[PDB]
């Protein structure tokens, strides 16, 4: 199973960053091509983009940077993979993202905080995830130095360094035979619509393990015409939920599941 973790982690998304046309440039501006980590956040991967376009604009021209796809702004705290699966799966590669330096929508999009604060959203997501899995038991026993290693493991794309700590977060007491609750979030047609996150257990009353279909039957019976997409694949609805929470989660220990129609 360790092979799945590695190809989930090292997943990529070819992306084309084109400067929004409205923007004025001293000299001509090239698109920046790049492979974004599905598990990372737009917050981390874009100083290389900000720096690329830094050259062609005077200080007066430059403002806070933000990203759009097809008119809709991109949330800084949704994982890059999840954003793509939900919003751009049907379109043609590479992922065409528009880069702005003007007209930030203060009404519809959170600000890009210090890189410090995406780290905040990451750790709160892990904390919430751990609360469902363990009654918050494990992440409260880690040294602070471990929280910054989880973060810097995600940040520097070092797999084994990250999963050095994260493995403990995936373990459970033998008698329980699975997590208490599974940390998951379901997304429907757009980012703006509120995601679903309820309580649900990976082991039944009988002792048999619950599947993906059980989660969907219980939490979202509209996915049973529709496509269920996790990290760019459609796992069989007969897939045990506990295994999915263990292997197909994003680094924030959550199962970001997309519901999208065909084709």
């Amino acid at each position: 199973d360790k092979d799945v973790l590695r190809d989930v982690w090292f997943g990529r998304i070819p992306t084309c960053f084109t400067l929004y046309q409205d923007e004025i440039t001293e000299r001509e501006a090239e698109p920046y091509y790049l492979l974004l980590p599905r598990v990372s956040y737009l917050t981390l991967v874009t100083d290389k983009v900000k720096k690329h376009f830094q050259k062609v604009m005077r200080q007066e021209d430059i403002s806070e940077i933000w990203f759009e796809y097809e008119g809709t702004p991109l949330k800084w705290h949704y994982p890059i993979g999840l954003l793509f699966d939900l919003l751009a799966s049907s379109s043609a590669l590479p992922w065409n993202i528009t880069v702005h330096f003007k007209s930030f929508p203060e009404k519809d999009l959170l600000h890009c905080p210090s890189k410090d604060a995406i780290d905040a959203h990451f750790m709160s997501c892990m904390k919430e995830a751990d609360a469902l899995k363990h009654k918050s038991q494990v992440i409260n026993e880690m040294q602070k130095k471990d929280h910054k290693q989880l973060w810097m493991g995600l940040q520097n794309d070092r797999f084994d360094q990250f999963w050095a700590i994260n493995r403990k977060l995936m373990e459970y007491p033998a008698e329980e035979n699975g997590f208490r609750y599974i940390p998951f979030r379901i997304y429907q047609t757009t980012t703006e619509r509120p995601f679903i996150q309820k309580l649900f257990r990976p082991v039944a009353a009988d002792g048999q393990l619950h599947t993906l279909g059980d989660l969907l039957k219980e939490v979202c019976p509209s996915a049973i015409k529709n496509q269920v997409m996790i990290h760019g694949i459609e796992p069989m609805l007969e897939t045990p939920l506990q295994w999915l929470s263990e292997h197909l989660s994003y680094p924030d220990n959550f199962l970001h599941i997309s519901i999208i129609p065909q084709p």
Binding site: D1, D3, V4, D7, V8, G11, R12, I13, P14, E30, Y33, L34, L35, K55, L93, P94, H231, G232, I233, E234, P235, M236, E238, T239, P240, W243, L248
Partner: protein, 40 residues
Amino acid sequence: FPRWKRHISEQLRRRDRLQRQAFEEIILQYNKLLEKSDLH
């Protein structure tokens, strides 16, 4: 290896052929050329 696990592992490789392997090498080559222009 049971049905779902095999099938999951195949898509992950299928996904990498389509999304990553297709663009990694050319994107790489594109950037090396770009530094040569920045530094005219």
